[PDB]
Amino acid sequence: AVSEWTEYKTADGKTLYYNNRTLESTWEKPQELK
């Protein structure tokens, strides 16, 4: 969806936003992606 974070979701319970910022993986939803 967004160019920054990789939207990485599975019904297995995976909420991952991997982005090359620092390689900052946001498992808490950032304000930069809904």
Curated annotation (Swiss-Prot):
It comes from the Eukaryota. Signal peptide: none annotated. It is found in: Nucleus. Residues 1-32 form the WW domain. Induction: Up-regulated in brain tissue from patients with Huntington disease. Detected in brain neurons. Transcription factor that binds RNA polymerase II and inhibits the elongation of transcripts from target promoters. Regulates transcription elongation in a TATA box-dependent manner. Necessary for TAT-dependent activation of the human immunodeficiency virus type 1 (HIV-1) promoter. Binds formin. Interacts (via the second WW domain) with TREX1 (via proline-rich region). Binds RNA polymerase II, HD and SF1. The FF domains bind the phosphorylated C-terminus of the largest subunit of RNA polymerase II, probably mediate interaction with HTATSF1 and preferentially bind peptides with the consensus sequence [DE](2-5)-[FWY]-[DE](2-5). The WW domains bind Pro-rich domains. This is Transcription elongation regulator 1. It comes from Homo sapiens. The lineage of its organism: Eukaryota, Metazoa, Chordata, Craniata, Vertebrata.
